Design a protein around this ligand. Structure first.
Ligand SMILES: Nc1ncnc2c1ncn2[C@@H]1O[C@H](COP(=O)(O)OP(=O)(O)CP(=O)(O)O)[C@@H](O)[C@H]1O
Ligand SMILES: [Mg+2]
Length: 959
């Protein structure tokens, strides 16, 4: 009767229900469920070519150009029509290629199919089906190096998986068996028992089970790998798109088009040409005003910039966003693996005798056998790859520091058995009973471990110092824990605390392993603090100094302790030594206490604010009025959960800041997607994780993403402004002829539009970006006073030389006056056509050189090379032709002029116009300040960040 959403069909499923779904029906249920859900295939439509063309041809411009071709054919200017078709043909081919390439990349990612082993309710079939996989299907996963087709909760056993594409996470991720329960929660809601579509399985092992077996949850390409590709198809728009502002500027040109049309009507009525004939002249005037090569030129800008970035390694999707890069005002960054260096030496461990802390051991090897050694060795979730161990750089560096070595493939639920170094001045090899994974939001990991001693099993928890110390029973927790940790965090050593609890369970029993994560991480005794050292990436310190110099503010968003983030921030130059840092702190509103905000300064040898994640939680919920003041003044957001990083992005955006994210981790995945410009620095090739994936492991990417964006925004504005200048230069030329004896050209018009303008337009879009990022932001409105001024003033100079030419031509003593008794197509030679075309041809080229204006955002014009050769070549051909048309006289329909003097006068006028155009654009750059000061002495931006800044300047936060 009424359709129900697949999510709505499977939203309320129990923990038990996922196990109920396991060993699902072989065929009848499969077929009906598969029919209801639809086939498990990516929904990218496949088009041979002509299938695309019909859809592609529906664009409104294409219709107008088709009408224009017919109109020009009716006028019998075949040659101009021959060009007008050909330029549209180039436009459609390039648009087709652009569209085809954009789909092809995405389609190539999702073009994967492989034979799958599927479990029957009383069966275990092998390689039976893949694309037809049942929505609730249970399957046995491959042993090693196996891509996972569907998002499936793991019912039994443990899996090691590479999720690098899905989460931006190169490091191997542990997967564990789901626990059946009366409560219903989604596998995604667990966010760990689920195995995600298109993720490689490094290894798969069942300690107790015969093999690892998983039950499919959300599937059919509409979740995970496809859910993101599906996002890339029909993508999210940008608000207040600059094309609207350009569309307003087209309306200013539309007034000029109407004014021209009425001028023509008066001239034609005065001329007394047939009314039927006058309509064709009016129609030609309107069609001429439309530029044929603009639609192609706009594509070629983007395609050249994608080409420029692909070579730099910054692999891009949604190429429209490269301009958005140009406008970004703040760039958010992550601490570890981006601002700092991935991989960290363990700078020893600190042990505690009783309540008191003992002095730090430089090398973890020289310590007594007991809890801390075992915890240091066993806490990690490292697995053994071919002749090697694979894990998180922190956990890997810790175990190598202990000197204990992981046992290989060769009880029941016994895994990752830890072999001792076997050097003595007890070896007691130890085996893990239960593994708990580390979640960035959760901020800790835990293990249950047993030994041949066969005592009560001991649970070891390694996690964030504050949460672990808080979780520990306050018996062992030292009085000065906070102050002692403050030494290590202030130094800049990433610190993780280890807590041990003896657990009263039956040792080496599978059943005994089953336990509540909270119950294992409940009552705890603080054991020691690890002192991991992460060092700043060499290039980070430079890029941040430039981004601060441009006045694009750099905000740091991190899950690590506030003092470490303050040390990294003070190091990079987020906060310079001259600058002052305030630590906003908040007390929870609860019992008899209301919410309190306390601001405490920090002093070290622009009023920068550093906020812990929890303080920001209270500020957003219980101080909404203050949030604008902190988020416009906050530089070092720290101890932030993965969800909190998205909130900073969203609140900074609602304050009208253009955010950017250069994170390299699963924690940032949310923030990267939400942010305007998102860059994932550790990914290989194009990926769905971020809009602008990089393959260089540095912040050196981010300046390049801004620098190219500003170039693409200036190229888009230059190509638009040159296309307007050409059309009005054509309008003036065609009109000067329309008044004067009702004449035009055919082959001449093909030559101008096809060779002079289309070649220059495509070639002017490949200049490339400026060397150094600049203080001045690229101008963002096409309908600006400078742009409008520049175009209008230049067109006056165009007309001046053009009219001057005609006056000089008529004034020439040898000049023979033209017949002016016969139709424009019939009068193949006209003495005026020769002069007007010959003067106008060169000026069409000159406009591009003046328009280029290559300095703040683009490199000097000469550096282009293919443009510069073409400009000179076409100029040389035109110089050659104007002096001596020879053979080309006949095709050009040129009236041969023997007199050298008038040709030199004509060359002089073009040179004068050229000098004029260059002088006008240089004058325009110099004149802007005087104009701006007089037009507006002072103004206030509607955007909230610029006002809140100005308010804070007038009255600061309480000092
Ligand atoms: N394997 C592990 N087991 C337990 N805790 C870990 C851990 N690896 C990191 N931690 C700690 O867990 C907390 C949360 O880490 P999270 O992934 O959110 O950020 P992070 O410390 O990697 C800094 P960044 O945000 O720059 O990536 C931190 O205090 C971190 O030091
Ligand atoms: Mg990271």
């Amino acid at each position: 009767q009424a359709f129900y959403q697949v999510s709505l069909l499977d939203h309320g499923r129990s923990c038990d229900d996922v196990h109920r779904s396991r060993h699902g029906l072989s065929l009848q249920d499969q077929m009906v469920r598969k029919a209801i859900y639809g086939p498990n295939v990516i929904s990218i439509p496949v088009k041979s070519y002509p299938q695309l063309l019909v859809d592609e041809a529906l664009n409104p411009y294409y219709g107008f150009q088709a009408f224009s071709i017919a109109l020009w054919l009716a006028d019998h200017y075949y040659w101009y029509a021959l060009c007008i078709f050909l330029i549209s043909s180039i436009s459609i081919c390039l648009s087709l290629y652009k569209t085809r390439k954009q789909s092809q990349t995405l389609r190539d990612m999702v073009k994967l199919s492989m034979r799958v082993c599927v479990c029957r309710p009383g069966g275990e079939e092998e390689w039976v089906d893949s694309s037809e996989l049942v929505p609730g299907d249970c399957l046995v996963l491959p042993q090693e190096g196996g891509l996972m087709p569907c998002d499936a909760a793991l019912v039994a056993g443990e899996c090691m998986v590479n999720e690098s594409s899905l989460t931006g996470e190169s490091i191997p991720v542990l997967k564990t068996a789901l626990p059946e329960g009366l409560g219903p929660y989604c596998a995604e809601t667990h966010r760990r028992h689920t195995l995600f579509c298109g993720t490689l399985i490094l290894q798969a092992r069942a300690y107790v089970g015969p093999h690892v077996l998983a039950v499919v949850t959300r599937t059919g390409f509409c979740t995970a790998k496809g859910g993101l590709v599906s996002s890339i198809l029909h993508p999210r728009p940008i608000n207040f798109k600059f094309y609207k502002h350009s569309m307003k500027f087209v309306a200013a040109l539309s007034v000029l088009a109407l004014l021209g049309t009425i001028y023509s009507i008066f001239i034609l009525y005065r001329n007394r040409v047939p009314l039927n004939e006058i309509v064709i002249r009016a129609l030609d005037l309107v069609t001429v005003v439309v530029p044929p090569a603009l639609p192609a030129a706009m594509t070629v800008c983007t395609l050249y910039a994608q080409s420029r970035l692909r070579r730099q390694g910054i692999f891009c999707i949604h190429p429209l966003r490269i301009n958005l890069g140009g406008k970004l005002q703040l760039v958010c960054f992550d601490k570890t693996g981006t601002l700092t260096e991935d991989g960290l030496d363990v700078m020893g461990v600190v042990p505690l005798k009783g309540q008191a802390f003992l002095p730090l051991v430089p090398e973890p090897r020289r310590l007594p056998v007991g809890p801390l050694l075992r915890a240091l060795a066993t806490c990690h979730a490292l697995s053994r790859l071919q002749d090697t161990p694979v894990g998180d750089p922190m956990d890997l560096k810790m175990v190598e520091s202990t000197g204990w070595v992981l046992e290989e493939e060769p009880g029941t639920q016994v895994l990752a058995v830890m072999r001792p170094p076997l050097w003595e001045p007890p070896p007691v090899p130890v085996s893990v009973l239960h593994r708990f994974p580390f979640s960035s939001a959760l901020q800790r990991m835990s293990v249950v471990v047993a030994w041949p001693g066969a005592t009560q099993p001991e649970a070891y928890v390694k996690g964030s110092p504050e949460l672990v110390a808080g979780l520990c029973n306050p018996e062992t927790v030292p009085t000065d824990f906070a102050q002692m940790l403050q030494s290590y965090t202030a130094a800049g050593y990433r610190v993780v605390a280890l807590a041990s609890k003896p657990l009263p369970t039956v040792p080496s029993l599978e059943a005994a392993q089953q336990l509540t994560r909270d119950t294992v991480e409940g009552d705890l005794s603080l054991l020691g603090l690890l002192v991991m050292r992460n060092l700043l990436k060499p290039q980070t310190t430079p890029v941040i100094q430039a981004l601060r110099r441009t006045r694009i503010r750099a905000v740091m968003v991190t899950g690590d302790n506030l003092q470490t983030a303050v040390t990294v921030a003070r190091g990079c130059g987020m906060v310079a030594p001259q600058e002052h840092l305030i630590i906003v702190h908040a007390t929870h509103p609860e019992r008899g206490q209301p919410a309190s905000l306390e601001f405490l300064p920090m002093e070290s040898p622009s009023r920068h604010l550093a906020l812990s994640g929890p303080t920001f939680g209270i500020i957003v919920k219980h101080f909404p009025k203050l949030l604008p003041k902190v988020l416009v003044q906050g530089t070092v957001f720290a101890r932030m959960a993965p969800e909190q990083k998205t909130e900073l992005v969203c609140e900074l955006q609602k304050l009208q800041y253009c955010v950017g994210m250069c994170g390299d981790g699963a924690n940032d995945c949310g923030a990267l997607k939400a942010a305007d410009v998102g860059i994932s620095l550790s990914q290989a090739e194009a990926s769905v994780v971020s809009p602008f994936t990089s393959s260089m492991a540095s912040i050196e990417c981010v300046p390049m993403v801004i620098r190219e964006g500003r170039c693409s925004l200036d190229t888009s504005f230059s190509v638009f402004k040159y296309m307007a200048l050409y059309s009005l230069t054509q309008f003036i030329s065609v009109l000067i002829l329309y008044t004067i004896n009702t004449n035009l050209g055919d082959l001449q018009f093909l030559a101008i539009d096809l060779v002079i303008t289309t070649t220059v337009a495509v070639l002017m879009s490949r200049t490339g970006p400026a060397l150094v990022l600049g203080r001045v932001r690229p101008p963002g409105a096409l309908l600006s006073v400078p742009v409008l001024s520049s175009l209008l003033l230049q067109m006056v100079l165009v007309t001046g030389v053009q009219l001057g030419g005609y006056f000089l031509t008529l004034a020439q003593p040898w000049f023979v006056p033209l017949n002016r008794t016969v139709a424009a197509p019939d009068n193949l030679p006209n003495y005026e056509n020769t002069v007007v075309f010959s003067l106008s041809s060169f000026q069409y080229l000159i406009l591009a050189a003046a328009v280029s204006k290559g300095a703040p955002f683009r490199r000097p014009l000469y550096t282009n090379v293919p443009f510069l050769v073409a400009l000179a070549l076409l100029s040389s051909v035109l110089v050659g032709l104007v002096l001596v048309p020879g053979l080309l006289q006949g095709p050009l329909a040129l009236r041969n002029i023997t007199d050298t003097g008038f040709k030199l006068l004509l060359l002089g006028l073009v040179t004068l116009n050229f000098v004029g155009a260059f002088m006008l654009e240089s004058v325009l750059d110099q004149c802007l300040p005087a104009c701006l000061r007089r037009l507006r002495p002072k103004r206030a931006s509607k955007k909230r960040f610029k006002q809140l800044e100005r308010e804070l300047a007038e009255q600061p936060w309480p000092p």
